Design a binder for this molecule. Structure first.
Ligand SMILES: NC(=O)c1ccc[n+]([C@@H]2O[C@H](COP(=O)([O-])OP(=O)(O)OC[C@H]3O[C@@H](n4cnc5c(N)ncnc54)[C@H](O)[C@@H]3O)[C@@H](O)[C@H]2O)c1
Ligand SMILES: NC(=O)c1ccc[n+]([C@@H]2O[C@H](COP(=O)([O-])OP(=O)(O)OC[C@H]3O[C@@H](n4cnc5c(N)ncnc54)[C@H](O)[C@@H]3O)[C@@H](O)[C@H]2O)c1
Ligand SMILES: NC(=O)c1ccc[n+]([C@@H]2O[C@H](COP(=O)([O-])OP(=O)(O)OC[C@H]3O[C@@H](n4cnc5c(N)ncnc54)[C@H](O)[C@@H]3O)[C@@H](O)[C@H]2O)c1
Ligand SMILES: NC(=O)c1ccc[n+]([C@@H]2O[C@H](COP(=O)([O-])OP(=O)(O)OC[C@H]3O[C@@H](n4cnc5c(N)ncnc54)[C@H](O)[C@@H]3O)[C@@H](O)[C@H]2O)c1
Ligand SMILES: [Zn+2]
Ligand SMILES: [Zn+2]
Ligand SMILES: [Zn+2]
Ligand SMILES: [Zn+2]
Ligand SMILES: [Zn+2]
Ligand SMILES: [Zn+2]
Ligand SMILES: [Zn+2]
Ligand SMILES: [Zn+2]
Lengths: 346, 346, 346, 346
């Protein structure tokens, strides 16, 4: 089969021909319909030799959607042909967190050598992929695969971050969304669908501010030095109930701290090495919690899919072939994809 | 192997010799260390011919603990010898409720013919039992099997009922526990371990009131017409924040309605066919929710086990052999078991 | 001043001339801008001699909005002219429930003789009204008084009922709203603003079903014997996560029980003497809680007002003068007001 | 009347004779029965001239308990003689946070010049004190005033910090308490009363570790470089579900970050200027929230009082006279009070 693999350190990913795999007992083989490109796949290929621990070669792609091609022995709940989205953050399935579906917060996955597809196990950027267990498949029915693929991470991750403090986001509340990219443009829509929060979007790019308005933001503010005061102008000096920072650079976190409300929240979702919120007295309002969430839960993915199927999630995508995969990753580096890049095997 | 089966309608269960089963892919074979007798096993054998739909024969026992004897193909997370408790209320594992571990509230288990062990599938009152999936096994480590078996239902069910309204049971709250039997005597202990609620126990039998005091009740009141006013004497006329009725007869539910607080809760856990709370204006206080909960969740079972391992759950038991099983069920009918009856295969 | 009072038992309310009151220490005198007519004002006038305990005469109207006319001694937080909505369900202010703003669930208001305006204290259907305390005034800013008056009950009461089980109403959930009248048409809009629940409206009147679609319902079904099965057709046989029954007759409650989901909720908000949910095993799904909620909380009223100010609550009203008050109550009996009737003193 | 006032900057507080105040409308005059000394009163007197904004003179003491001496006009809910504890963190009473009793998180108290007694308004370290409003009085009944005074802050503050993440602290959870002083020794007891968390105490002083065991800690560990690894030894390498750091120095926060669990919590309750948690990816586990909580809520104070009245809070105290006040503050500087210092006016 055809696939995109990261085959040497510091070199760009290449199109390859590898064995179509077979499912063993418990596993499921999917024909891939769509495979999302995430900014996190860049962090993975930018890792030095000493830091990279996902093994070589590695079939990329942790945002996966497909149709069931073959059942491994003993597997029930799925028939051949069912369209399914792949739950990425695989856990052990047995710990207290995993039993609540919160496999993203699995404590023992590291020690047992369970790694996500695209981040240690063969991923979705291939004609077929293996899924370890039936519990990591989420039905999508007649959902367009191209729009479903980003739901597995670009939808799931903001959905989770928002879900953690959803009780705070009642009528009267204000949610700030920093970074209207893959994640943030879905985050805005989530906030609108599951809350009455006023949504303020923040980005450097005026085109991305326009995108924020397109997908439901009540206001849009240019990022940088002016941002915090412009957000306080909009909030009447009360601050933002929640900041969802999908950029996660120091300047965005600083902004988040300067605007968050007393008893509010900051969710640092974007990843910049070294960047951190400084949570201590006089550096942040009273009661303003900060967290770095990770991916999301099984029940949350199903909820994201239910939003997509209800028409509440317009996911802006561009389609690529497997051959155009390498090129698409380069496009993702330059920031020229207006939403999410998706690969469709022909 | 030796087992206790319900073989004919209306007739008492008998000791039998049946094939030691083999695990297929995904399944786990356990040697049984302990098997609990529940009052619900009586309701099952008292069902008429037309109502009984669990099939014949049926190996009894839905409270199960064991050691892993054999792994079916593809099963990981457990090695031979691990002591495990069996999660009873099996669900489909894939629905929104099941993905949160809430397999007790699985919507699709009925239509798929997934039934608990002891209530449609072979149960624990046998030398060995099959468990369908790894996710239905909960490690107990070095916990005494005899005291662990009741945790799977007698602990789990009250733990769940209490868990649903645990936010209400803060300092200042009062919890009434009606029926200090298998479930209720564990319920009292749970309330003490996980809340600061004042605990008032209610029972007909003065011996069971003594048992309530033994396990942590702050007061004990004889049941009947006088119970409500005696509970109001203790609560200063404010009412009970929560009533956990483990009897569930009409008179106990009536009592529960006459004592529950404004914005409080009634959990009808005991089962008497025809009995019901009457929830309508003027028949119950404002904001006083009522529910009939069912069994409990995967994460809840682990929590109950963690309580047992921490020394917070004194489970009063009497041990029986497989041969004494039939006799132990007659003893459970008369109400002569002070706590929970447990069968240990020799 | 002019007002509408209930002056003798079983007789209709009449227009009267009574002293313009003065605020004592702590109190606030409002000039009334709008005064809502609620179906509950009918139940009050339908009470027999023996049951009626609100005193005579009684200035009607528990849905009140005004402008501050005079401050009683020691009162701060409000200046003359501020437009305010009146929080109706007055409590003692000191108990555990009142300290959380939950004055609707005040335990000690009954024994202290604190009664709502319009239901024991002088109400809003007058040129001026007294409010006991500053904590019972909610700023509305430039909100149209006519549309703000229903927020105090018609908005607040459904907002509360929904707030209690809001965690259940995620994407994928279904909320049924029975009775698309004053309350129910605001309930539908609340569900849309604060949740991603699919909203199914139920009413006897096809015109009210049209009204349900106008205000955002995803479907509408005629009430009666057919309702339950038509709701199950729409939910795929899964049932309704939540039923908010604003009629509260036995037939609507029966419907609610026949459609509610496993681990779902029924909120009996409408009031029919004798009507009740029958909550017991086999009469309702496992885990399906039932409650009769009452009015709502202080923080909830502010939230309802925040929804109105954000444009999320189209409140359908008809305006009346104080002279047309009596007539407007007769019009409310026949069910000819399409939404909520509001009295505006000139 | 006699009182202790901070009268010049950088000078120690002195015993003075000032007018017995009179309550105006809404206010309540209390005869003080007990007045707690908090470490925060030291931070206040250590402030430079430029930073100190509480006005001079200032009657100290923000932990206050008394009996009602006189009612201001219009005040109801309290009769002369009622023993009451004073809710310290006064807010505006009208905002969304204040209406939920969360006056600690009042957004508008700063701009309105509402300041706590002992931190801007006359405090409790005097024969009498004024309380602005009835809502800031909490009945204590026959509770010993000396043991009730610390409940208003030393009890309330840890109760709040714990209350925020109480859902995390189920059976199986571990709570670390760093600093077994005034606050921390009450925090340990709270954790035991309202949760099944395993409690690990951390302190520099072996005497304070002994105190931790006296009041219910399951283990005790010497603070410093070794602390984190010793906590991980106890938790099986899983980490602590929650860290409540009542010291709040950088080294304790660093420790808290090195031991907190994935999806856990750090509550930085102690105050060291400049100290902060560094919440960013790779510097703290996934999902581990951090917050600096402030004081606590009205309903929480009542809950703390209910714990004291139930016998669940052994508050270690030493009594002082008003004359010994100055000396008692010097004793608090050196750290020679084993628990909380309380002043009783003679
Ligand atoms: N927490 C998790 O588990 C998780 C999951 C998936 C992705 N991520 C991370 O989230 C981040 C975002 O992913 P994406 O694919 O949505 O990003 P992206 O590449 O699609 O674009 C990010 C957006 O942020 C904007 N931006 C850049 N710098 C900015 C600044 N200083 N201020 C304001 N806006 C700025 C860009 O204009 C763009 O609109 C990445 O760092 C990624 O690694 C985290
Ligand atoms: N909700 C669920 O999923 C679930 C799970 C397990 C059991 N159950 C049900 O819970 C009930 C209790 O189970 P158990 O095993 O503790 O029962 P048990 O027979 O072991 O003990 C019953 C106790 O209730 C007392 N009692 C009887 N009548 C009473 C009255 N009028 N007032 C007060 N007390 C009275 C008895 O004296 C005894 O102490 C059973 O009826 C069973 O069907 C429900
Ligand atoms: N819980 C509380 O504190 C509280 C507060 C306010 C009002 N209420 C109660 O709520 C109820 C409704 O109040 P309202 O003023 O909104 O009513 P309304 O008179 O304004 O509207 C009634 C609506 O219910 C519909 N209806 C009547 N019978 C029906 C049936 N069998 N099936 C379906 N729909 C039916 C009517 O067609 C109409 O659309 C009243 O009984 C009132 O007393 C309760
Ligand atoms: N959040 C709020 O509003 C609020 C309210 C009251 C107090 N506080 C703050 O809480 C803090 C604690 O108050 P307290 O009155 O309990 O203090 P205290 O002086 O009574 O107790 C200090 C305790 O911490 C221990 N300690 C000191 N350094 C340590 C280290 N490196 N590692 C471990 N333990 C150490 C000491 O041995 C002692 O047991 C203060 O800094 C105070 O300002 C905050
Ligand atoms: Zn990703
Ligand atoms: Zn796990
Ligand atoms: Zn049972
Ligand atoms: Zn299921
Ligand atoms: Zn009303
Ligand atoms: Zn009250
Ligand atoms: Zn203090
Ligand atoms: Zn406030």
């Amino acid at each position: 089969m055809k696939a995109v693999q990261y085959t040497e350190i510091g070199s760009e990913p290449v199109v390859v021909d590898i064995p179509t795999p077979t499912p063993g007992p418990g596993e499921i083989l999917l024909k891939v319909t769509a495979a999302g490109l995430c900014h996190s796949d860049i962090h993975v290929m930018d890792m030095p030799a000493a830091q990279y621990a996902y093994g070589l070669p590695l079939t990329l792609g942790h945002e996966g959607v497909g149709t069931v091609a073959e059942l491994g022995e003993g597997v029930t709940g799925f028939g051949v042909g069912d369209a399914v989205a792949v739950y990425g953050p695989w856990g052990c399935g047995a710990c207290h967190a995993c039993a609540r579906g919160r496999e993203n917060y699995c404590t023992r996955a590291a020690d047992l050598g369970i790694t996500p597809p695209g981040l240690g196990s063969p991923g979705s950027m291939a004609e077929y992929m293996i899924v370890d267990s039936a519990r990591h498949l989420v039905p999508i029915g007649d959902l367009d695969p191209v729009a479903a693929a980003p739901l597995t991470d670009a939808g799931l991750t903001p959905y989770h971050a928002i879900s953690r403090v959803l009780p705070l986001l009642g009528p009267g509340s204000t949610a700030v969304v920093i970074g209207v990219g893959g994640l943030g443009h879905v985050g805005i829509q989530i906030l609108r669908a599951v809350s009455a929060a006023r949504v303020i979007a923040v980005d450097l790019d005026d085109d991305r501010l326009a995108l924020a308005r397109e997908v439901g933001a009540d206001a849009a503010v240019k990022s940088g030095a002016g941002a915090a005061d412009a957000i306080r102008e909009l909030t009447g000096g009360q601050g933002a109930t929640a900041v969802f920072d999908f950029v996660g650079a120091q300047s965005t976190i600083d902004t988040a701290q300067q605007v968050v409300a007393v008893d509010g929240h900051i969710s640092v979702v974007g990843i910049h090495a070294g960047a951190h919120a400084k949570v201590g007295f006089f550096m942040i309002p009273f009661g303003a919690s900060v967290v770095t969430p990770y991916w999301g839960t099984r029940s949350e993915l199903m909820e994201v899919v239910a939003l997509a199927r209800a028409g509440r999630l317009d996911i802006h995508t561009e389609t690529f072939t497997l051959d155009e995969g390498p090129a698409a990753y380069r496009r993702l580096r330059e920031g020229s994809i207006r939403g999410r890049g998706v690969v469709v095997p022909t």
